């Protein structure tokens, strides 16, 4: 199992193991931040063994940037090492207590291997600390933002900027590498949200999964590609939902577009039924995302198939 410790700055560091999504690192002066925890108590602990190879500082603070399971229920294994406040956004929390338990059941069954260690789960990581729009921690001098600036990926999406050497960790709402996964998407919200982002004006940038992106024309790549994936998911949802087509012909549409220009991305095909049957309502008026089930995917493989 490859894993990546990638020392970005100073005082920043991102984790990624072969996979899994991307967590990152804040050293401080007097503690760690982590954003996002490892999928499970027992995977997370090979994170915090890579923080021990660089510090003996307690673990204060863990920020989740979105709700999905895989990003948050490790955060139970950082309290013995100094863990202080769960840290989400009020988006977070709703969707934790909307549909915490559905997604956790939902994602474990969808892909068992991002969970090694299932066992070590406790239930739901449940934040101690729910900010509005933007709390700035002052680790000792560093300080570090963690900010609200738009929906994308869910509602709630949390991203963590630290001014004085420009990373941002962007949780799943900035790819490269990768396909977005798109079930929850607020996506006609996305691209305006990818624009605040690029106005922070980032040297470094931590997407959802893969490697770290390492200066700003990788950064507003980084920007630009999730862009257009997100603005051509929808546009083919809202061409789907104009001539009445059922999900097996919105998919066939949005492969038109999305297959030639994004089709080499990893997990696209893992991401792509759940993003075309995410985007098709949307388009229908459903603003706020249906939750997703087992029978929820039974019933879209069904209708993509036979
Ligand atoms: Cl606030
Ligand atoms: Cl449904
Ligand atoms: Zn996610």
Not at 116 to 122: I, K, Q, Y
């Given at each position: 199992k490859k894993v990546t410790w990638t020392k970005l700055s100073e005082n920043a560091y991102a984790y990624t193991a072969e996979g899994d999504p991307n967590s990152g690192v804040i050293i401080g002066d007097d503690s760690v931040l982590i954003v996002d925890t490892t999928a499970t108590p027992a995977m997370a602990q090979d994170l915090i063994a890579k923080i021990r190879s660089v510090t003996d500082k307690p673990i204060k603070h863990v920020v989740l940037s979105h709700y999905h399971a895989v990003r948050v229920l490790?955060?139970?294994?950082?309290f013995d090492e100094g863990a202080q406040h769960v840290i989400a956004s009020r988006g977070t929390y709703e969707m934790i207590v909307e549909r915490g338990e559905a997604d956790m059941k939902s994602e474990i069954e969808r892909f068992?291997?991002?969970?090694?260690?299932?066992?070590?789960?406790?239930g739901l990581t449940w934040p101690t600390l729910v900010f509005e729009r933007e709390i700035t921690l002052f680790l000792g001098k560093l300080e570090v933002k963690i900010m609200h600036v738009g929906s994308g990926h869910t509602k709630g999406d949390t991203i963590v900027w630290l001014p004085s050497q420009k990373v941002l960790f962007s949780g799943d709402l900035v790819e490269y590498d990768a396909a977005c996964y798109c079930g929850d998407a607020q996506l006609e919200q996305w691209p305006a949200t990818l624009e605040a982002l690029r106005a922070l004006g980032a040297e470094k940038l931590v997407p959802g999964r893969g490697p770290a992106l390492l200066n700003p024309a990788e950064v507003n790549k980084g920007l630009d590609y999730t862009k257009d994936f997100v603005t051509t998911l929808l546009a083919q949802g809202r061409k789907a939902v104009e001539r009445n087509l059922d999900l097996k012909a919105a998919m066939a549409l949005t492969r038109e577009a999305m297959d030639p220009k994004f089709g080499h991305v990893f997990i696209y095909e893992h991401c792509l039924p759940f993003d075309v049957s995410r985007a098709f309502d949307e388009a229908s008026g459903i603003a706020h995302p249906r939750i997703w089930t087992a029978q929820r995917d039974k019933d879209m493989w069904a209708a993509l198939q036979d």
């Open positions: 490790g955060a139970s294994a950082y068992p291997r991002l969970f090694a260690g299932v066992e070590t789960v406790p």
